[PDB]
Amino acid sequence: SAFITFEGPEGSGKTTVINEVYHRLVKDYDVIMTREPGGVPTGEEIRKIVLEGNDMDIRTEAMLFAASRREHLVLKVIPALKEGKVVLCDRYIDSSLAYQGYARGIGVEEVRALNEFAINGLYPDLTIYLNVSAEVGRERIIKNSRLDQEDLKFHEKVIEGYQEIIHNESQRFKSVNADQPLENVVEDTYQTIIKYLEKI
């Protein structure tokens, strides 16, 4: 079994990459694609509170992302890992660290303490970081629409946040150059994963 998380800002090609990697890995492995809350009832109820919130306090929001993370981990991820599955998870702890911790300014160490209470030692076996520059990311976000200064600044802070998290911690982390055309990003991600799965 393997617990593989995918991290990156919007515009990193993360959705395309997970889907294409899934379609290739399924040939050889019993693989599932998931994201939080991922259909888990309590997590779905938490997701409704977050989405229906009117100017919700950022710490309450962080605690709800963490509660949805736990429910998804306990009721979906852990049972799949027990069945010997390869679990491809779109966003995990590092998303809370980059978004709530860094970009929203709660503090990375504070959001880490919160999320370590939530995951209780269950860190990913491997984390794919889709390393996109703000500029390439911006262009992909514009393309995927129909950006204002606040959106551009928030996108930059998320990227700065991811750079800081990787700078301080890098073992499970494997950074893929997401500035490349998506065909190459998919190939490098697939190769990185196969290399890991073949080391058992």
Residues 6+ apart with CB under 8 A from 35: 89, 90, 91
Residue nearest to ligand 43N (CB): 99
Give the residue with the Cβ less far from its own copies, 169 or 187: 169
Q: How far apart are CA 114 and CA 117, in angstroms?
A: 5
Tell the smallest beta-carbon distance from residue 168 to its own copies (Å): 6
The one of its own copies, ligand 43N, none whose footprint includes residue 13, by CB under 5 to 8 A per kind, is: none
Give the residue with the Cβ less far from its own copies, 67 or 108: 108
123 contacts its own copies (rule: CB under 8 A): yes
10 is annotated as contributing to ligand binding: yes
DSSP assignment of 98-131 equals IIIIIIT-S-HHHHHHHHHHHHTT---SEEEEEE
Q: How many CB atoms lie within 10 A of CB 113?
A: 10
12 is annotated as contributing to ligand binding: yes
Tell the smallest beta-carbon distance from residue 112 to ligand 43N (Å): 12
54 contacts its own copies (rule: CB under 8 A): no
Q: Quick one: tokens of 40? A: 């888990």
11 is annotated as contributing to ligand binding: yes
184 contacts its own copies (rule: CB under 8 A): no
Q: Are the CB atoms for 1 and 85 separated by under 8 Å?
A: yes
Contact string (CB under 8 A) for its own copies, positions 82-121, x = contact = ---------------------------------------x
Q: Number of helices (H) and strands (E), helices first, in the chain?
A: 9, 5
**Annotated binding-site positions for ATP:** 8-15
